[PDB]
Design a protein around this ligand. Sequence first.
Ligand SMILES: [Mg+2]
Ligand SMILES: [Mg+2]
Lengths: 97, 81, 129, 150, 155, 184
Amino acid sequence: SINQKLALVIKSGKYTLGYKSTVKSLRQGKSKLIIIAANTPVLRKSELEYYAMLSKTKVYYFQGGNNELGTAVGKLFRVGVVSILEAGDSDILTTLA
Amino acid sequence: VLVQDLLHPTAASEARKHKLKTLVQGPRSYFLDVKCPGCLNITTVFSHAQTAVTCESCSTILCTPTGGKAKLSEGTSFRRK
Amino acid sequence: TRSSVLADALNAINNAEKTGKRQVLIRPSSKVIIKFLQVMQKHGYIGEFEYIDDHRSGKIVVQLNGRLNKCGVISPRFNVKIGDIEKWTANLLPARQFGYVILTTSAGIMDHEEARRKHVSGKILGFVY
Amino acid sequence: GRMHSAGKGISSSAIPYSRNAPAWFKLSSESVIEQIVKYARKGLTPSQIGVLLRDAHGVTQARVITGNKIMRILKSNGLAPEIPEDLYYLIKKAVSVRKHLERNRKDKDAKFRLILIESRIHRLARYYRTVAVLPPNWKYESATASALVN
Amino acid sequence: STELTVQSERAFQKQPHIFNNPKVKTSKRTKRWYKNAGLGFKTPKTAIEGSYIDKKCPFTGLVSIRGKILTGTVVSTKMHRTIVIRRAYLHYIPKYNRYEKRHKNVPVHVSPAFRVQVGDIVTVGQCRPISKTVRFNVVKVSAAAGKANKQFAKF
Amino acid sequence: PQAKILSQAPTELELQVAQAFVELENSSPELKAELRPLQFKSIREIDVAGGKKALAIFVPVPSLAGFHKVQTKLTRELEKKFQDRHVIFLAERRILPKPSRTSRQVQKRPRSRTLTAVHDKILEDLVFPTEIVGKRVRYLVGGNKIQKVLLDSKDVQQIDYKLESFQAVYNKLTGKQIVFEIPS
Ligand SMILES: [Mg+2]
Ligand SMILES: [Mg+2]
């Protein structure tokens, strides 16, 4: 269900993968929801929570590490955090998850 | 019986048979025009709907999926076809 | 899996005839069955048969007359020459004066007597007597 | 029946004899097509589009109301996916069985079930490669198959 | 094959008894020889205006197509200007009054005028012994579309 | 706008029908987009066994959807002006023969161009206001083959007096002995 919402964001919306582009999108205020993996380091996720609190973007915690975010967004590499720039035909922003 | 009319079976005989095993196979399912208490608009639903069909006004349930025929939501007003 | 719809039709007719029934319902009513039944009806071993045209394959209700002894299919459809038809009729038919071996031929579905008199040969479908 | 079971149940759908239906449909054959495409833009597979059309709307069948079937409508409107929906659901079933299998290695029933599911995948994929729905050399690998589902 | 190493070995590859005069110049600079194969086999256009030599070509070479005309399916193109076709046929046994599927592999010399792929249907014409096993040349390749169009990236 | 609604030069048997279309256009609210653009190919006259005649007119079948919308109206006053006739609204669907073994490869025949599908569509357009709910084919013991067409019991009062004219024109076109019945 959540992976289906991620897959519909990838097919129809806009997103950035990785930590550095997510921080840049949070600084630009262009982020709507940031999704952070389970095995991401706690200092890294604490800084992502602070930037999302400082920019008023929602935070979702993926139930699975960076290997599972990479597969859920359709890629063959580990994704530690994915930012959603603009939702497509999915309701991933209206739904809390 | 050793002599029967396969080409013209009884309507009572055909009504109790399986939907596939009649003389010409067809469905026993139908469609309903439902008015919710919320509004007056007619929404067409299926008898074996198997999804929680919704209206604009009372957007919680107009029916409820079951094993067979859908259960209408105990306050709706429906007519066949 | 249904491999020969003609074989399933001829077994249904034979089972209804051996139990003495006067009517039989046949699925799924191929046109090879229609042409085979037309030869049987032409020679009188059956009577009227009416094809219920549903939108998938159809059904056939054949009216028997207590007159057919055995309608069978030869499977596989062997290629018969013009000299092998006498061997097939001697093997399959109870006598030389009645009974017909039905041949699928490029001149049409026909029994062995009008196939010999047309001088045409093909593959063999089955027999009726 | 039941290619990988002993079940003989029939339990199918008997569509009507009427090839023009259903004489109370006041919706246009065009408007149901953009309702098909709207649901397909929401990611719904052709089977879920037909279910939802039959339930919320009066769509008995898209082929009897429009001129073609739902997957053909999506192909002509450009929303056909890389994989057919039946092969897609077979592949994600085998992926979910394997994900269960690494957590439960001694699930010999699940190993038997995975072999049956994967053999259904190879038969369906061979049919698709014969009919060129799938490209030739398309191989189910059981290791890159998670990339086909995402 | 007009290009990609027409002259690629120690001998100069040219058609025999065909003279290119270096005194009477022309606007083509290449005097090519070709023939009609016969039996309603159209001489291919790449054979007409190519630059390959292929002394065993049935249109530009010194081999005549005569004898038997067969049809087979290409199963190997890994040799140089030579293919193996697979001819599948039914053999009848009188005792059981039935048949068996049988195959015979035929090695066929192929000209570089034709492009031959595995899965293609070719018709082959008998010639004189070309090699130890080869007695046939490809005279026409039968492929219109090849079922290779709906097999690509979707959107 | 007399011969422009026929698209052929002959003849007066359809020219009087074509003009009878124009004098039946005194319904300006519904003349537009309902009756004005409609146009027919040819007229056949069939004699029924009851001594009457029947008009079997052909429309070019891109336009049965819009033409059927006025058919159930237009049949009424066309019959009032042309009594001793039964008007049937057929479509001109091309029949292509099936290819032989030695024939040249023409483009693949669509199933709508086959002889059996055209005859089925002739039947469906012949009984338009009713819907066919079943078909039976009796194979008589003498070799006869009689088609039976089952009609929906809803909306039969408009067509019940024309079943003989329907089976006479269908025998005239398709050459097939047919009957009709209405289940109850
Ligand atoms: Mg079964
Ligand atoms: Mg099996």
